[PDB]
């Protein structure tokens, strides 16, 4: 049982590498191997100091390794010590805040975006007094820094990119070198991405796949005389490191050595190192999914691929006797439950009787199932898959029978009447093949006659069908009640509350039950007739809102309502959507709130029990008769039991299957998938930690050589995330005291855009921080750490300014202050543009193409659009999908004005730019950022300035998580530009005028891109 | 910075030892050292298997290392694996469930009490299939097992005893050896304790301090030819281990080697090994103590020797600027607080102004302070110390001034009137010096006149004084309302509800305010006169109960009441006492409940705010006006910050100081303390973990060579305790199925005395366990582990018996089943005695002298006391303090009878034994068990059978915990027997008839002690 070895470093005969998230050292001389540091969290990088004594270590924390910081290790005494309390943000693809290199004097230089407004701005800092002080190198963003003959060698974006092999976009690793104690020149800028640079002798060695596969290459300190030193074909090599004589690297889970003076390469022998307990325990609620109420007040729920039948208290628990991957569980009868079992071949319907213990499992493959339901009479089930098919599966035999297939999207919204006769479901459709909107009409399938009827017209979005217990009327919801709501900031309107319920009587001549038409006055007593039933449709007198479900009951109707809310929290913090359960009394037509803070709701078969999930993440259950008597469903009384290796294989196969099933190009997916399966599967058995599996899975994802192949979430550690204490200030260790070097502030009147000290009426800039909470900080006391320990609370800070100016305030200590730095940056550039253009040019920045981008764009757009010129800076734009909505605004051509008796002119359109527009972009703007960039040029809105963009334009829409919560993405939607095809993918967008931002530009404190932008517009504004 | 090394083992040139709770291996040949296993919890023992490849490891879990289990380590692949799921109970002094040795075939033999009714019954088991099965050796309790020339060598109680040096009691380690494939003979039984036995060649080497200090000795396999091989004088040697050629051991934190063939000893060189981060973070609530309400709705609380002023939400927090050991914090004024700072020299009064930040700290030593209060006017404080003095400390200067000194106990119950003029306090007293009861009278000190008056008489217990806001009446409580409550089981009565409140008007001629005497009819308007004020005392018309506090308010009186409850939970589970806050309306005289589930209550200076702690451990605060508006006091918003080394030094000094201050003999304490301080202090800086400090502290505690020097609680790890799944059954691996070998049951009708399977109406004995919760158990499936993971819930168990007898039940899986085993044992012995004496002899067992012993004694006493003879088995009796109450019952001599018209004779006394009594005791009965034993003989109640007892009769009453929760105990009360002095200490009690229970007795399944007891009584019963 060998281990997966990676990320090595070397010094003489000693070699340190990572194994099982812990750091190991190996001695070539004796062949001995030992763990020198562990239990710190997941370690992904370790670097020997010059002397080969101390070791800088990067370690990640937070279940999803969402945070990271650096530690020092002194091999002499075996002392460990945290150096940075920045709590840097990191992701698998971008594992920022790391060791950058070492300076001549032996000092550690780190790369971090912790004090920057943008994550890609990983600026270089010289570490001092072990984290007491940080000195900026001002060389701009960089991943590696080397030193050759007194010359600084800069490596930009030179980290590894296993998730995207053959990458050739604008963010591809490049190398620069100093030529004149401040003058820099780019010396390595190949077609492909260059990573892990090192220097042996007077040559720079790096990795690249310019030839189709990862190999080691080198050039002189001028980028001339290229040479290929390896011919690997099994696994890409990674993480080059050296001591000055030999080069170390990992490959296929092993450590290799390359001697430049011999061009000889050899695998170091390590063998078995650690095999932890395979059987692990987990908290079921942590991975719980799908919670459903059963007869007898029992509960069923899925967690980590396992299923369980239990009482609400969680004292009596039964595990479903079925191997890994149960996706869904559903009431199938008195003591029976149907379930969906997933394997590598696909999804299958299964049944389990928890009273007798029997559990058959059909062999008919249903495809990739995303919805499942069983009729109240336990005769058949209804299933939806990714083939866009809706079908019934005979629970007796297993024979699936397709009812209908949509060609637009999945048919997951359906319901079965209580008499098991009809099936109502939302059927996605389009009027045209290239139509921008997908409509949805409700369809009804009659088991007798086996014919499909149209419950509703196809002009909008109809959903949430529900039959009344008697099976006489079909209720459902629609977004057909168009009525606009005004925007409070921008001249705009949208449909916020246009949801309303409707009903359809299954017997013609029968009226809408909620209309309360006297029975004596209605001559019903007809028979079922679903023909032209959409004509008999009728609404129910309920105020329009945003409804997600309607449950018709005897003398009332329950409705799930979602109040209008912003999308920022849900978009960047996974914040769940808060709903409330309403009750509509049919007789009094009065509405009332039955339960709030809801995030999900399920209803019993007999409509008597209600199961819900609230905003606190907990699951509750209450009788529909007495909602005041709810109980909390306990699931953690019993540990979840599993096998690391069984899960790892399962997860790898699923990741591999998703990558294949969702790749935008099917043909390509066929070859790529089959050609990489076994290769990466062979490494799975060597994995013992989640991080190990990640290394393997991401590498197999890179085989698609396409953008947007990510791995998010998941449980890699149980260590609490690193914390950082922030007050939006920059400290400088001057003498033996810290001085506020800078106090950040954007718009003083906005929320959260300045240092909390401003609230006391003083600008902290220039003051000395005497102490925090009675503890002296300074020369001998790391202010970053002290703040770290007060994050999230208020601490008494003692400040000293000009003269006897002494202050004693209770300061809020933030957990983060990125946004404050960001807005400060924006206002700075905005002030700068106004001053340099003498008040003739506006400025707007767009951070991403998501919700934040929409905020920032309008936040400044409403005040900067009426200058003679306008600069639209989209540098560092993280993408998303709203580029089209913004482009639309910038496309508005001003063609008129409004002349008032009093006041000033009003432009028409209101949302139009007044004059010339100029766009600024860089290699850090990508995806929707790529699309916006290409678009701006394509529509001729103005000139595009900067550097070629990222080049990743194949979008994603994940719809599955691994059994551990992990969310993998697959490039499923290839963007095609008219007159460019898919070309932007793996290339990016070239600016009309290329303006590099070299390292010497940063040293001079000048932004060449913005200056050119200003100068250019000024030149254009002379008419 | 060297580390503390301990508990080593050797095999060739490799040597494994423990450092920082982790396991290390060291190679003598290369001098290399490495950590081979970590993050498992605290490891205290590791043993090499025969081949020198696998390693058996004992690891502890639970914050207080309250649990333990064994693991295997395969150095070949580096595989780790849990072997036992017994979750054995352990304590520092008794670290049970360990490796016992290895058999010739290379099989591991363990010692454990996990399946026994008594913790001392650490029986020997041979491990099989890595924990799948355990085979009993039936050699009785044993710590070590060795093999010499096919002969089994047994070591009883041979573990180390660092907390009791020079121990010579009945439980001292002894060695036995086999002489005839079943016949055993005791061969090493010295005056002192023998530990860590090993065999090199044909000699047994062990440790002992027969000469005054720990040294290594050896004898031949007959116990003859004793030899001393070392002459240490610095630190006792410990943990002997060998490979057959050399002997390994630890001393003063270093590893040594002893070569028997040379008699040469040398320290192995290891040097620095690991120095973790000194600065640690802690959860404040985990170590919180003392919570007090301040002005402005602020809160003050002490935690881990630190103090803090915060708002109830815990968002605004101030740490008091004072070095380690703040014991108490109290409101001193608007924005001032008084505190008690403790150092090695003693306790000091200090003041801190949290508004200005100033914080003076007086230098006058107050002694060991146990109570502190400040007057409402911030002029002076009141303090109580262990010198039994009550005093006032001028908060302006610091000059303490003793008011009065008690010669019985501390004066910690006091109060100060609102006008700061009087001080009322409980004054402990005795009528005679040798009086068995300490009385308590309330005393009042008048600052003007400086005279002390008697508020109450000295005939009982008066407490909880409280002045009314106007300072006109003194309220207090008393246990003077004698009224008996009947016992439901035994003919007995006790005072349960005899607490009643009383008041005393400070102005003679003024009536009891709660009597509602019309003002017009009372001619008050007098002046203060405290003379003979105890004569004017008056009660308030409130039903008697168990009151702990009285708070007089304007038109009502608050009273804290504690419902009558059992003591078992509080005695063995630390369960807190539940109280309720009552309100007594002075006008209507009606009482009502204001708040329940309380465990503690504090009241504001202005009597407007109430702060409480509830049974959930959380702290709450509510206005006295609207108790429905309580808020939870949050304290964990901010991490607690400290330094390992500063705390370790602090804790060691405190432990050392307590050991000196509380030792029963002052003279002795003077010499012992000063002679050991530096010696053990030098090891503290080598400690990096709590377990490290424990090794050092306990060793310094052993220097007192007295019993009852323990170390309990504390936080050693953050690992969850080991769990064990029990169903009160013994499984046997027969073939590839487990069969219930034994199904335990005591009294089927009592609560918790049988296997939960019995509730289904079947005896599981003989059945086969097919599976548990769908999972097959047997040959390839450790049932202990499966159960382990279901503990605390119900699982479906499939059983198979005679023929097609198949059962499927939901069985409760217990977390423990010791009590069930215990009662089963007792009922077995009880049945046995009845059958062997032909129904002429009764039987009773006493497990301890605490609450459990009281239960068990009466549980059988009421049915076994009227036989011709009676056996009182007190074997394994854990001690406590109720021996005197039990001896009293056994002392009752029957001298009469009651003759009824109908029915049978009633004996007088009812609680008398009818005939001859016989006591049984062993070396596992100690302390109060020693006392009971000595007593039985001394009073001539009957003959005493068995083996000499433990020998620890110097009692404890701890009253301080270390800053981490640790509870240390000091032998403070030397028991003196008339005509024996303190002799029993470190010796025990010799039985009239010695009856060894040798290893071959256990092999024959016979209890020689009980048989002799029966036979003896039978012989005595022939008259």
Coordinates of N, CA and C in Angstrom, one line a residue, chain B residues 540-680:
Chain B
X540 N -40.2 34.2 59.6 CA -41.1 34.7 58.7 C -42.0 33.5 58.3
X541 N -43.3 33.7 58.2 CA -44.3 32.7 57.9 C -44.2 32.1 56.5
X542 N -43.2 31.2 56.4 CA -42.9 30.6 55.1 C -42.7 29.1 55.5
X543 N -43.3 28.3 54.6 CA -43.2 26.8 54.8 C -41.7 26.4 54.9
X544 N -41.4 25.5 55.8 CA -40.0 25.0 55.9 C -39.6 24.3 54.6
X545 N -38.4 24.4 54.3 CA -37.8 23.8 53.1 C -36.3 23.7 53.2
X546 N -35.6 23.8 52.1 CA -34.1 23.7 52.0 C -33.7 25.0 51.2
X547 N -33.6 26.1 52.0 CA -33.2 27.4 51.5 C -31.8 27.7 51.5
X548 N -31.3 28.4 50.5 CA -29.9 28.7 50.4 C -29.6 30.2 50.3
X549 N -30.6 31.0 50.3 CA -30.4 32.4 50.2 C -31.7 33.1 50.4
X550 N -31.7 34.3 51.0 CA -32.9 35.1 51.2 C -32.5 36.5 50.8
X551 N -33.4 37.1 49.9 CA -33.2 38.5 49.5 C -34.4 39.3 49.8
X552 N -34.3 40.2 50.8 CA -35.4 41.0 51.2 C -35.5 42.2 50.3
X553 N -36.7 42.4 49.7 CA -37.0 43.4 48.8 C -38.1 44.3 49.4
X554 N -38.5 45.3 48.6 CA -39.5 46.3 49.1 C -40.8 45.6 49.7
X555 N -41.6 45.0 48.8 CA -42.8 44.4 49.3 C -42.8 42.9 49.1
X556 N -41.6 42.4 48.9 CA -41.5 40.9 48.7 C -40.1 40.5 49.1
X557 N -40.0 39.1 49.2 CA -38.7 38.5 49.6 C -38.4 37.4 48.7
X558 N -37.2 37.4 48.1 CA -36.8 36.3 47.2 C -36.1 35.2 48.0
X559 N -36.4 34.0 47.7 CA -35.8 32.9 48.4 C -35.4 31.8 47.4
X560 N -34.2 31.2 47.6 CA -33.6 30.2 46.7 C -33.9 28.9 47.5
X561 N -34.5 28.0 46.8 CA -35.0 26.7 47.3 C -34.4 25.5 46.5
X562 N -34.0 24.5 47.3 CA -33.5 23.3 46.6 C -34.4 22.1 47.0
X563 N -35.2 21.5 46.0 CA -36.1 20.4 46.3 C -35.2 19.2 46.7
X564 N -35.8 18.4 47.6 CA -35.1 17.2 48.1 C -34.8 16.3 46.9
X565 N -33.6 15.8 46.8 CA -33.1 15.0 45.7 C -32.0 14.0 46.2
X566 N -31.8 13.0 45.4 CA -30.8 12.0 45.8 C -29.4 12.5 45.5
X567 N -28.4 11.9 46.0 CA -27.0 12.3 45.9 C -26.2 11.5 45.0
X568 N -26.7 10.4 44.4 CA -25.9 9.6 43.5 C -25.3 10.3 42.3
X569 N -26.1 11.1 41.6 CA -25.6 11.8 40.4 C -24.5 12.8 40.7
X570 N -24.8 13.5 41.8 CA -23.8 14.5 42.2 C -22.5 13.9 42.8
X571 N -22.6 12.7 43.3 CA -21.5 12.0 43.9 C -20.6 11.3 42.9
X572 N -21.2 10.8 41.8 CA -20.4 10.0 40.9 C -20.4 10.6 39.4
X573 N -21.2 11.7 39.2 CA -21.3 12.2 37.9 C -21.1 13.7 37.9
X574 N -20.7 14.2 39.1 CA -20.6 15.7 39.2 C -21.9 16.4 38.9
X575 N -23.0 15.8 38.9 CA -24.3 16.5 38.7 C -24.5 17.6 39.7
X576 N -24.8 18.8 39.1 CA -25.0 20.0 39.9 C -26.4 19.9 40.7
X577 N -26.5 20.7 41.7 CA -27.7 20.8 42.6 C -28.7 21.7 41.9
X578 N -29.9 21.2 41.6 CA -30.9 22.1 41.0 C -31.8 22.8 42.0
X579 N -31.8 24.1 41.9 CA -32.6 25.0 42.8 C -33.7 25.7 42.0
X580 N -34.5 26.5 42.6 CA -35.5 27.3 42.0 C -35.6 28.6 42.8
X581 N -35.9 29.7 42.2 CA -36.0 31.0 42.8 C -37.4 31.3 43.1
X582 N -37.7 31.5 44.4 CA -39.1 31.7 44.9 C -39.3 33.2 45.3
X583 N -40.5 33.6 45.2 CA -40.9 35.0 45.6 C -42.0 34.9 46.6
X584 N -41.7 35.6 47.7 CA -42.7 35.6 48.8 C -43.2 37.0 48.9
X585 N -44.5 37.1 48.6 CA -45.2 38.4 48.7 C -45.5 38.7 50.2
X586 N -44.9 39.8 50.7 CA -45.1 40.1 52.1 C -46.5 40.5 52.5
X587 N -47.3 41.1 51.5 CA -48.6 41.5 51.8 C -49.6 40.3 51.7
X588 N -49.6 39.5 50.7 CA -50.5 38.3 50.5 C -50.0 37.1 51.1
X589 N -48.7 37.0 51.5 CA -48.1 35.9 52.0 C -48.1 34.7 51.1
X590 N -48.2 35.0 49.8 CA -48.3 33.9 48.8 C -46.9 33.7 48.2
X591 N -46.6 32.5 47.9 CA -45.3 32.2 47.3 C -45.4 31.7 45.9
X592 N -44.5 32.1 45.0 CA -44.6 31.7 43.6 C -43.2 31.5 43.1
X593 N -43.1 30.6 42.0 CA -41.9 30.3 41.4 C -41.5 31.4 40.4
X594 N -40.3 31.9 40.5 CA -39.8 33.0 39.6 C -38.9 32.4 38.5
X595 N -38.2 31.3 38.8 CA -37.3 30.7 37.8 C -36.8 29.4 38.3
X596 N -36.8 28.3 37.4 CA -36.3 27.0 37.8 C -35.0 26.6 37.1
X597 N -34.6 25.4 37.3 CA -33.4 24.8 36.7 C -32.2 25.6 37.0
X598 N -32.2 26.2 38.1 CA -31.0 27.1 38.5 C -30.0 26.3 39.2
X599 N -28.7 26.7 39.1 CA -27.7 26.0 39.8 C -26.8 27.0 40.6
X600 N -27.1 28.3 40.3 CA -26.3 29.3 41.0 C -27.0 30.7 40.8
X601 N -26.9 31.6 41.7 CA -27.5 32.9 41.5 C -26.7 34.1 42.1
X602 N -26.6 35.2 41.4 CA -25.9 36.4 42.0 C -26.8 37.5 41.8
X603 N -26.7 38.5 42.6 CA -27.5 39.7 42.5 C -26.7 40.9 42.5
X604 N -27.2 41.9 41.7 CA -26.6 43.2 41.4 C -26.5 44.0 42.7
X605 N -25.7 45.1 42.7 CA -25.5 46.0 43.8 C -26.8 46.7 44.1
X606 N -27.4 47.2 43.1 CA -28.7 47.9 43.3 C -29.9 46.9 43.4
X607 N -29.6 45.6 43.5 CA -30.7 44.6 43.6 C -31.7 44.7 42.4
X608 N -31.3 45.3 41.3 CA -32.2 45.3 40.2 C -31.9 44.2 39.1
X609 N -30.6 43.8 39.0 CA -30.3 42.8 38.0 C -30.0 41.4 38.6
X610 N -30.4 40.4 38.0 CA -30.2 39.0 38.5 C -29.4 38.3 37.5
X611 N -28.3 37.6 37.9 CA -27.5 36.8 37.1 C -27.6 35.4 37.6
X612 N -27.8 34.4 36.7 CA -27.9 33.0 37.2 C -27.2 32.1 36.3
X613 N -27.1 30.8 36.7 CA -26.5 29.8 35.9 C -27.6 28.7 36.0
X614 N -27.8 28.0 34.9 CA -28.9 27.0 34.9 C -28.2 25.7 34.8
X615 N -29.1 24.6 34.8 CA -28.6 23.2 34.7 C -28.0 22.9 33.4
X616 N -28.1 23.8 32.4 CA -27.5 23.5 31.1 C -26.1 24.1 31.1
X617 N -25.6 24.6 32.3 CA -24.3 25.2 32.3 C -24.1 26.6 31.9
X618 N -25.2 27.1 31.2 CA -25.1 28.5 30.6 C -25.5 29.6 31.7
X619 N -25.0 30.8 31.4 CA -25.2 31.9 32.3 C -26.3 32.8 31.7
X620 N -27.2 33.3 32.6 CA -28.2 34.1 32.1 C -28.4 35.4 33.0
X621 N -29.0 36.4 32.5 CA -29.2 37.6 33.2 C -30.6 38.2 32.9
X622 N -31.3 38.5 34.0 CA -32.7 39.1 33.8 C -32.9 40.2 34.9
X623 N -33.8 41.1 34.5 CA -34.2 42.2 35.5 C -35.1 41.6 36.5
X624 N -34.9 42.1 37.7 CA -35.7 41.6 38.8 C -37.2 42.0 38.6
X625 N -37.4 43.1 37.8 CA -38.7 43.6 37.5 C -39.4 42.7 36.4
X626 N -38.7 42.2 35.4 CA -39.3 41.4 34.4 C -38.4 40.2 34.1
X627 N -38.5 39.2 35.0 CA -37.7 38.0 34.9 C -38.0 37.2 33.6
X628 N -39.0 37.6 32.8 CA -39.3 36.9 31.6 C -38.3 37.4 30.5
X629 N -37.7 38.6 30.8 CA -36.7 39.1 29.8 C -35.3 38.8 30.1
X630 N -34.9 37.5 30.1 CA -33.6 37.1 30.4 C -32.8 37.1 29.1
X631 N -31.5 37.3 29.2 CA -30.6 37.2 28.1 C -29.5 36.2 28.4
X632 N -28.9 35.6 27.5 CA -27.8 34.6 27.7 C -26.5 35.4 27.6
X633 N -25.6 35.2 28.6 CA -24.4 35.9 28.6 C -23.4 35.1 27.7
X634 N -22.9 35.7 26.7 CA -22.0 35.1 25.7 C -20.6 35.5 26.1
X635 N -19.8 34.5 26.2 CA -18.4 34.7 26.6 C -17.4 34.2 25.6
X636 N -17.8 33.3 24.7 CA -16.9 32.7 23.7 C -16.8 33.4 22.4
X637 N -17.2 34.7 22.4 CA -17.0 35.4 21.1 C -15.6 35.7 20.9
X638 N -14.8 35.8 21.9 CA -13.4 36.1 21.9 C -12.6 34.9 22.5
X639 N -11.5 34.5 21.8 CA -10.7 33.4 22.3 C -9.9 33.8 23.6
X640 N -9.6 32.9 24.4 CA -8.8 33.1 25.6 C -7.3 33.0 25.1
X641 N -6.4 33.9 25.5 CA -5.1 33.7 25.1 C -4.1 33.6 26.2
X642 N -3.3 32.6 26.1 CA -2.3 32.3 27.2 C -1.0 31.7 26.7
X643 N 0.0 31.5 27.6 CA 1.3 30.9 27.3 C 1.5 29.6 28.1
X644 N 1.7 28.5 27.3 CA 1.9 27.2 27.9 C 2.9 27.3 29.1
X645 N 4.1 27.8 28.8 CA 5.1 27.8 29.9 C 4.7 28.7 31.0
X646 N 4.0 29.8 30.8 CA 3.7 30.6 32.0 C 2.7 29.9 32.9
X647 N 1.8 29.2 32.3 CA 0.7 28.5 33.0 C 1.3 27.3 33.7
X648 N 2.1 26.5 33.0 CA 2.8 25.4 33.6 C 3.6 25.7 34.9
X649 N 4.3 26.8 34.8 CA 5.1 27.2 36.0 C 4.1 27.6 37.0
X650 N 3.1 28.4 36.7 CA 2.1 28.8 37.6 C 1.4 27.6 38.3
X651 N 0.9 26.7 37.5 CA 0.2 25.5 38.0 C 1.1 24.6 38.9
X652 N 2.4 24.4 38.5 CA 3.3 23.6 39.3 C 3.4 24.3 40.6
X653 N 3.7 25.6 40.6 CA 3.9 26.3 41.9 C 2.6 26.2 42.8
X654 N 1.4 26.3 42.2 CA 0.2 26.2 42.9 C 0.0 24.8 43.5
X655 N 0.3 23.8 42.7 CA 0.1 22.4 43.2 C 1.1 22.2 44.3
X656 N 2.4 22.7 44.2 CA 3.4 22.5 45.2 C 2.9 23.3 46.4
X657 N 2.3 24.5 46.3 CA 1.9 25.3 47.4 C 0.7 24.7 48.2
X658 N -0.2 24.0 47.4 CA -1.3 23.4 48.1 C -0.8 22.2 48.8
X659 N 0.0 21.4 48.2 CA 0.5 20.2 48.8 C 1.2 20.5 50.1
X660 N 1.8 21.7 50.2 CA 2.4 22.1 51.5 C 1.4 22.7 52.5
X661 N 0.6 23.6 52.0 CA -0.4 24.3 52.8 C -1.4 23.3 53.5
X662 N -1.8 22.3 52.7 CA -2.8 21.4 53.2 C -2.4 20.1 53.8
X663 N -1.2 19.7 53.7 CA -0.7 18.4 54.3 C -1.1 18.4 55.8
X664 N -1.6 17.3 56.3 CA -2.1 17.2 57.6 C -1.1 17.6 58.7
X665 N 0.2 17.4 58.4 CA 1.3 17.7 59.4 C 2.1 18.8 58.9
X666 N 2.0 20.0 59.6 CA 2.7 21.2 59.3 C 4.2 21.0 59.3
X667 N 4.8 20.5 60.4 CA 6.2 20.3 60.5 C 6.7 19.5 59.3
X668 N 6.1 18.4 59.1 CA 6.5 17.6 57.9 C 6.4 18.4 56.6
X669 N 5.3 19.1 56.5 CA 5.1 19.9 55.3 C 6.3 20.9 55.0
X670 N 6.9 21.4 56.1 CA 8.0 22.4 56.0 C 9.2 21.8 55.4
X671 N 9.6 20.6 55.9 CA 10.8 20.0 55.4 C 10.6 19.4 54.0
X672 N 9.6 18.6 53.8 CA 9.3 17.9 52.5 C 9.1 19.0 51.4
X673 N 8.3 20.0 51.6 CA 8.1 21.0 50.6 C 9.4 21.6 50.1
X674 N 10.2 22.2 51.0 CA 11.4 22.9 50.7 C 12.5 22.0 50.1
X675 N 12.4 20.7 50.4 CA 13.4 19.8 49.9 C 13.0 19.2 48.5
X676 N 11.9 19.6 48.0 CA 11.5 19.0 46.7 C 11.2 20.1 45.6
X677 N 11.0 21.3 46.1 CA 10.6 22.4 45.2 C 11.4 22.4 43.9
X678 N 12.7 22.9 44.0 CA 13.6 23.0 42.9 C 13.8 21.8 42.0
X679 N 13.9 20.6 42.7 CA 14.1 19.4 42.0 C 13.1 19.1 40.9
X680 N 11.8 19.3 41.3 CA 10.7 19.1 40.3 C 10.4 20.3 39.5

